[PDB]
Design a protein around this ligand. Structure first.
Ligand SMILES: O=C(O)C1=C[C@H](O)[C@@H](OS(=O)(=O)O)[C@H](O[C@H]2[C@H](O)[C@@H](NS(=O)(=O)O)[C@@H](O)O[C@@H]2COS(=O)(=O)O)O1
Ligand SMILES: O=C(O)C1=C[C@H](O)[C@@H](OS(=O)(=O)O)[C@H](O[C@H]2[C@H](O)[C@@H](NS(=O)(=O)O)[C@@H](O)O[C@@H]2COS(=O)(=O)O)O1
Ligand SMILES: [Zn+2]
Ligand SMILES: [Zn+2]
Lengths: 743, 743
């Protein structure tokens, strides 16, 4: 019903010649009365009634924060509910009171610089847009011109500016409320009197924002960490609902529906969410994605997401109207318990989440490649793994906020966002320059700490404008080489991911590969294991290599055995790493941490203590383990086997390294896993021997896709098995004996 | 133990400074006494004794083709056995007799031009080389000179010439005995005196022959059809054995072991092999791959291939010595019964073979893409399917020889090797030329008939010299888009292949795609089905489109139904095709055949009656069906459902077309298969309805790889299933309802 017209090569929907067209059209208006009589939505309307009352004079902070405005009270709430009333009743004097109440305060409103003050401005513009569109037929010619002028005056105050030519389109402040809700709403409201605003705001959205999001949406994930996922995705979902309710349909790739499934997978038994990107920690109250769950759940009619909403069905005051207008109260809700235990996020991510269940005894493991880096709140964490079981065991260390400061802090710039903070790999070139010239909006530094980790992409560690700039730049940080999970879809025995993350680092490396193999052991005593096989080729043999494993508490290093426990905050998990490569004759295993060394980076420690009453579990981490070769060599391999059990467990599984023909592997429990000795495609016959009792489950990786023949003890076991393209692997059951594989 | 020194960027092994080095080294000489006393090899040793006798003067053909020589009798056998005796006994005078018995004849021998005379010349050279190498320490210096001289003289007579600069390195006469057996053997023998012959012959083998073969070998198939597979693969294996026995190890990609598995899959219950490329037919004696089964089975110690050899352990006379020297008589043998019922051959083939069993009641079906065309004995058959069940049903038409002539015949040029002879697709452009000037060695012809079919690649329909030339030229005919079978490896419910064969045709088309889905119905009444879905976009809407189905006996057409039966030669299978697209209002179904029309190509019948006493079942065919749109259009679609059963089966499965959202499919028995309506990737939600009792097995194709969600009747059925890269498909089970799919 809306007309699509090409603008500058990009097709755009023209706002329809009717009012209302903001958040609803006239066809939805009669249903507002039915929503009014819906008991589930009576409470939210009753909440808005209470919000009409002004702020109490003794409660008004001295710094008028973005939180102050989002905890919406007083006049603007009164004019929205009055506008809602006109929408429903059409009584002219109501439409008049709403218009008259706001017009003056709108054209003369002032905002004193504060934390994210564009959000208070933008919300105040939205109140205006609501009045202007909903009460349109009661507007006077002079008033139409007054509103428009006030909007332009307010629009100039936003961080993105007006015209909105400033900031970034994939990340940053311009990927939040200001364009995708605030400027978009106003533009739609005033299109017939002043078309310019929509044209520039929706113009930038369609040209840049939309194109970028539709590129990564098919892989069903977000890139800004597990905290900012809220403000970033919520605003993606506002643009969805707004453009749809205008009559433009769903502009986004429908893969948008499954984005928040990642958070469902990342949920641990204590109501907290697995770490990733710029995050803080807490153990007081569970973390919720209320608004994104509300908006996506109700648009796509998804019961898993709606279940996530109904956990804490309480939105921010300034979003109460949108819940009132948009919530689907008839949609059912689904617990995550019937979902498959592993889930894969493809290009441009290459991420795996593997679980052992959905109950309190759940191992939750993450494995990451990162094919691209989006910057902002993303960390340079290519190759990182992270493991939870009754407490965070292998952790994504550091904190976003603390004694060091905020986003700006020399801790974010030197530890938290850097590879050294994560369970990945370091290669130390003492001459390497890390340009950070563009990072942050203040306290700007030209160079950052050399952590031996991954590059700082962009014009001095700054995200690109749009996808076009991103694809032509230097933000590529890896390639997914292979992936898959267990023979069964629902309850996979194995979950496999492999990446080449060479392009994440500088030319100091010739090649960096990492293969992850998570095993669900289907056992109460030792529920899961994780095999990590790494290949690192340095450009100079004298660039010291590091394998990192971070923890909260201090690890026990006993030979090639690392043991990490949880014994605080009710956490009782345990991680035990068996270091298989390099050889015992070539491995040094040093721990570094505790006070003064907790955030250690090659000379300087970047302290960041928890702000009072926050992060009571110290999930920011205090310790890390470093595995290094004894000999200076260009080419090294790491092979570590992690086992997971509760701290109450004495005897785990014996870990045996398989040294075979062309392959290297691991045997534990009833599982056997092999990799190419050189971590390259195996395109020729290979073999190895297996000694042990009972039936084993075999996973052979790095294989040339095609038809393989498996021989055991000189005889045909399997005459023909197909190794497929996506995993490049063979799976089968067999007993002890000498195996040969033909291709 | 041999040294490899690089010649022209290509590493080449140097013959060791020791004798013997031809066919064996000194370390296997002691084992010749053991072989002598082997109860299995004493029959072949007695055979060679019998072969010492000259041709009875009555029996001499006086047109002496290759067969006269290959049926080796007389002097050449005598001197080889004398050489063999010298090897085992070292009695100097025996070495002397071997040399002096052959030297004069080797200098003086003449060869009248006849059918493949180079084969006799080469064999005579082999005889000379045996004496030379095995009796080397008995040669006088002057005799070496004489031998060398005689070898060069004889070499000049070979089709490849000397220097061996003529003919092709992948196909043709130079891919037979002349270089890979004969020149190579002589070069190895005389290397210390005349290193040139080995340098040039092995030069060309290592630079050209080997490179080409190692390129396609990983996909475990051959390109010259099911007859010339014998001579061609036999000679590959001679080179394997000769160089290995020289001490160079295995120069080939070990995937060479599995090539002959293709013949195993193509064996019918009547002892014949499924047609393909240049073949003739017989019901009189079974076809055997005796020599390649012997050489590959014995080298690779493969019991499936050795089984193939033992069906008829009867080697041609000239090969008897090689059986004596090389056969492994301890090796076991396995029948094919435990092999998986489907086998895939990847790039550059893209060929699926699918069966329902290994016995008399098995269906055998073949599906082909063809990524490249090798020419010579390969047919222009991209997209062809072939079905056998209790007789050839959906056939591969024409015959190699008959009343038209041999290889150079009008039948070969204008029908047999052409697309119209195959169950594939025609697009008739009345102005298209088919340049054939290079084809064949005699009776050359500038143009071949317009069959509405695929291009004639190369420079006048002639193969390129080597791989370098092949990749640079116009030999690409297809791209494999997707393939797979399952859900079980051993006995798959379904077998799937998709190709884009646009490149097989001239610019008269913009797009040609073919998807095959073979269904093993696991059904007593209808053992199998095949669905074929085609997309064809013509450059001119008026270029008439044809979908073809060849049969031996006359098909019955009733509305959208074609019935093909076998009722002769003890054959009793039946084929029933349901034509689903184009629909009735846009479909013309016609049959062409019977006397004068068996080999019809737009105005002309290319008659090729059987040679008497041959093709008793008339597998060359007499009939075809053509499905053509009623309406001229650029873009058209074919959808055809073939059911296979006994010719006495009255009731077959009802076939229904599924017209969904974004997809089109088929429902028959308990099976549901969908395709993209445009044969393109489905990257958005889609759906369709299912009506019917019971549980159905779904196979959805053309899907964007990643995590899909299945809903039935508005409810989640499967919260998450993964479509994989190689097949781009979802498989699951379900009952009737309205299905939606989310990605
Ligand atoms: O909404 C955010 O992205 C965000 C909220 C805060 O403004 C700030 O976090 S903090 O209060 O804990 O310090 C932080 O804003 C960043 C912003 O993400 C950066 N954008 S980017 O350039 O695209 O990466 C940038 O603008 O800097 C802001 C804070 O830096 S500061 O103002 O110099 O302190 O995250
Ligand atoms: O071994 C063969 O490939 C082959 C043997 C025969 O010489 C002939 O078969 S026939 O007697 O049934 O006609 C045929 O030889 C072909 C040969 O394969 C062609 N090679 S190619 O150019 O590389 O494709 C070519 O040389 O033509 C021959 C036939 O013409 S002729 O030699 O003049 O008889 O197949
Ligand atoms: Zn991090
Ligand atoms: Zn053919």
């Amino acid at each position: 019903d809306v007309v699509w017209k090409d603008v500058d090569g990009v097709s755009m929907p023209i706002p329809p010649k009717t009012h209302p067209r903001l958040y609803l059209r006239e066809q939805q208006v009669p249903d507002l009365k039915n929503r009014m009589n819906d008991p589930k939505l009576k409470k939210v309307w009753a909440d808005m009634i209470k919000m009409q009352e002004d702020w109490k004079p003794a409660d008004i902070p001295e710094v008028k924060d973005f939180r102050f405005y989002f905890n919406q009270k007083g006049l603007t709430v009164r004019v929205e509910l009055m506008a809602l009333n006109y929408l429903m009743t059409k009584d002219p004097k109501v439409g008049r009171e709403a218009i008259t109440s706001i017009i003056d305060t709108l054209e003369t409103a002032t905002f004193k610089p504060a934390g994210d003050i564009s959000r208070g401005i933008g919300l105040f513009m939205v109140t205006g847009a609501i009045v202007y569109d909903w009460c349109y037929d009661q507007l006077k010619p002079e008033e139409k011109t007054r509103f428009v002028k006030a909007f332009v005056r307010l629009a100039k105050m936003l961080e993105c500016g007006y015209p909105p030519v400033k900031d970034k389109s994939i990340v940053g402040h311009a990927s939040e409320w200001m364009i995708m809700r605030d400027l978009l709403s106003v533009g739609i409201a005033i299109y017939d009197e002043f078309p310019e605003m929509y044209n520039l705001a929706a113009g930038r959205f369609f040209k840049e924002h939309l194109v970028a999001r539709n590129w990564f949406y098919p892989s069903h994930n977000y890139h800004q960490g597990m905290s900012y996922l809220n403000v970033r995705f919520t605003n993606d979902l506002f643009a969805l609902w707004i453009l749809d309710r205008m009559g433009a349909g769903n502009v986004f790739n429908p893969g948008q529906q499954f984005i928040l499934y990642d958070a469902i997978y990342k949920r641990r038994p204590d109501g907290q969410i697995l770490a990733g990107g710029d995050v803080d920690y807490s153990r007081k109250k569970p973390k919720y994605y209320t608004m994104p769950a509300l908006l996506a759940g109700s648009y796509y009619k998804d019961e898993y997401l709606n279940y996530e909403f109904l956990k804490d069905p309480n939105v921010e005051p300034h979003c109460k109207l949108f819940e009132f207008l948009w919530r689907d109260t008839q949609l059912g809700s689904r617990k995550p318990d019937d979902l498959p235990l592993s889930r894969y996020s493809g290009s441009p991510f290459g991420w795996m989440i593997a679980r052992t269940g959905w109950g309190p005894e759940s191992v939750i493991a993450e494995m990451k490649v990162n094919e691209y880096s989006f910057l902002n709140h993303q960390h340079q964490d290519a190759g990182a793994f992270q493991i939870y079981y009754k407490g965070p065991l292998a952790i994504d260390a550091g904190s976003y906020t603390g004694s060091s400061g905020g986003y700006n802090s020399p801790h974010n710039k030197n530890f938290f966002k850097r590879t050294i903070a994560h369970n990945s790999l370091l290669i130390y070139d003492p001459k390497e320059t890390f340009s950070s010239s563009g990072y942050g909006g203040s306290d700007h530094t030209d160079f950052a700490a050399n952590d031996g980790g991954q590059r700082l992409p962009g014009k001095g560690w700054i995200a690109p404008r749009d996808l076009k700039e991103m694809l032509a730049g230097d933000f590529r940080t890896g390639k997914i080489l292979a992936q898959g999970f267990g023979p069964d879809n629902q309850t996979p025995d194995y979950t496999y991911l492999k990446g080449d993350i060479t392009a994440a680092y500088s030319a100091k490396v010739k090649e960096v590969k990492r293969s992850f193999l998570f095993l669900n052991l289907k056992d109460a005593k030792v529920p899961a294991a994780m095999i990590v096989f790494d290949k690192v080729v340095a450009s100079n043999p004298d660039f010291k290599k590091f394998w990192l494993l971070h923890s909260i508490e201090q690890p026990e290093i006993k030979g090639n055995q690392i043991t990490i426990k949880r014994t605080k905050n009710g956490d009782s998990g345990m991680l035990v790493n068996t270091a298989l490569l390099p050889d015992a004759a070539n491995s040094n295993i040093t721990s570094i941490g505790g006070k003064g060394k907790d955030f250690w980076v090659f000379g300087t420690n970047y302290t960041n203590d928890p702000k009072p009453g926050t992060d009571e579990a110290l999930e920011r981490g205090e310790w890390r383990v470093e595995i290094t070769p004894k000999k200076a060599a260009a080419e090294d391999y790491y092979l570590n086997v992690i086992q997971i059990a509760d701290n109450t467990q004495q005897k785990l599984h014996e870990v045996k390294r398989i040294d075979g023909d062309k392959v290297v592997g691991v045997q534990l429990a009833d599982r056997i896993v092999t990799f190419s000795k050189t971590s390259e495609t195996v395109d020729r016959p290979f073999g190895f021997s297996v000694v042990g009792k009972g039936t084993f489950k075999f996973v052979m990786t790095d294989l040339l896709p095609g038809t393989w023949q498996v021989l055991k003890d000189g005889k045909i076991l399997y005459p023909a098995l197909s190794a497929k393209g996506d995993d490049g692997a063979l799976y089968f059951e067999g007993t002890e004996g000498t195996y040969r594989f033909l291709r």
